[PDB]
């Protein structure tokens, strides 16, 4: 393609290209062995809100 030029054979493709979505979400914990890797201070935050999540803790030190 070139700047300053457009035609149907682009427009039809662009509307197809940007409708793409993966089969499984990038945010799904399935990609991360089913856990969230977090620091100690992050797990303190969760406890303050209540809730209960499958966290995993790294010391960071």
């Amino acid at each position: 393609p070139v700047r300053g030029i457009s035609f149907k054979l682009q427009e039809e493709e662009r509307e197809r290209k940007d409708q793409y979505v993966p089969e499984v979400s990038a945010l799904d914990l399935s990609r991360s062995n089913g856990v969230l890797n977090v620091d100690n201070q992050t797990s303190d935050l969760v406890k303050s809100l209540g809730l209960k999540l499958p966290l995993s803790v790294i010391n960071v030190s």
Partner: protein, 206 residues
């Protein structure tokens, strides 16, 4: 007050953590020392994600008040925000501006881009400064996504979040669209998750 059904759910919490929205990075301004939970030993600060939820609903209740939806303008010059605002303006009735803002769009009628918004939503108050400044000449209120380093002039509602990560930008716009459609009748119930996946809002490089 809003009933308990508006409380932050555990499922949404997982989304916010997975997208790293709670990483506030460094160079904290003196305003927005609230919204900070604690500092790590390495120096990154943890944003209180509980307050992020509260403010996001408040912003949604402001957008839902506008009498007709095309009067809402969503702006993103930065490229990681562009697909997000385009999708936001498709599910809601809002009007998008992506790329160059062209100065004199709220002042200077006799311009092809001339508009009269009722509300402006900005993705980055430092990069989008031209749009914020010009709004102040004409009595327009402003909502902004803000990181802990953001300047604060003329922003009325700050939503505190990680403003740099590609997933963080997309996720926040996604949640706003869900909340406005659900304060309106367009989604029938707050208890059932929305069918659109978050990934539809993410930036796509190659």
């Amino acid at each position: 007050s809003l009933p308990a059904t508006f409380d932050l759910t555990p499922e949404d919490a997982q989304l916010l953590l997975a997208a790293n929205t709670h990483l506030g990075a460094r160079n904290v301004q003196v305003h927005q020392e609230p919204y900070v939970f604690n500092a790590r030993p390495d120096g990154v600060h943890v944003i209180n994600v509980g307050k992020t939820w509260e403010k996001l609903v408040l912003a949604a209740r402001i957008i839902a008040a506008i009498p007709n939806p095309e009067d809402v303008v969503a702006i993103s010059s930065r490229t990681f925000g562009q697909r997000a605002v385009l999708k936001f303006a498709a599910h809601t009735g809002a009007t998008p501006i992506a790329g160059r803002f062209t100065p004199g769009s709220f002042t200077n009628y006799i311009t092809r881009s001339f508009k009269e918004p009722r509300l402006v939503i900005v993705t980055d108050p430092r990069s989008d400064a031209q749009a914020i400044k010009e709004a102040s000449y004409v009595n327009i209120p402003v909502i902004a996504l803000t990181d802990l380093d953001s300047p604060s002039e003329f922003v009325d509602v700050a939503i505190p979040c990680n403003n740099r990560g590609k997933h963080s930008i997309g996720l926040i716009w996604y949640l706003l669209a869900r909340e406005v459609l659900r304060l309106r009748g367009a989604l029938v119930d707050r208890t059932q998750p929305w069918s659109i996946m978050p990934d539809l809002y993410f930036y796509r490089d190659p």
